[PDB]
């Protein structure tokens, strides 16, 4: 997915969402945020979507 | 080596001429060992996604 070769659709009914505000003048790659989010998913529950 | 084997055969052998009796006794012990009541326990549900 990180490479431009795959697109994934995750079917969620409803979920808690959180969001971060960045500066448009600062280039960045947002992969670490998702990886952190993935790092805390388990069959018991999930953290809020960033 | 339940019977007919105490002081007649070696520790590393088995009597081939008394096989039926020994097998029968072994099964009898197998049977007697399982005479129990399958008691119930605490059933519960799982909140896990599985």
């Amino acid at each position: 997915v990180k490479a431009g070769r795959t697109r994934v659709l995750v079917e969620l009914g409803h979920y808690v969402y959180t969001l971060h505000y960045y500066d448009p003048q600062i280039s960045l790659d947002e992969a670490p945020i998702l990886e952190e989010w993935l790092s805390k998913i388990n069959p018991a529950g999930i953290p809020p979507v960033p | 080596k339940t019977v007919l084997s105490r002081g007649y055969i070696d520790n590393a052998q088995f009597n081939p001429l008394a096989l039926r009796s020994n097998v029968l006794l072994m099964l009898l012990q197998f049977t007697l060992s399982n005479l129990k009541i399958n008691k119930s326990s605490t059933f519960t549900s799982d909140v896990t996604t599985i």
Binding site: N42, A44 | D46, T48
Partner: peptide, 30 residues
């Protein structure tokens, strides 16, 4: 403060049983 109560012990036990590791060391990512 908020109202919250511990879940029944039986449920917690079974739930904690099935918790695979989220991140694992795999020598392959190709």
């Amino acid at each position: 403060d908020i109202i919250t109560r511990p879940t029944s012990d039986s449920i917690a036990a079974v739930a904690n049983a099935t918790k695979p590791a989220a991140v694992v060391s795999d020598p392959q990512s190709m």
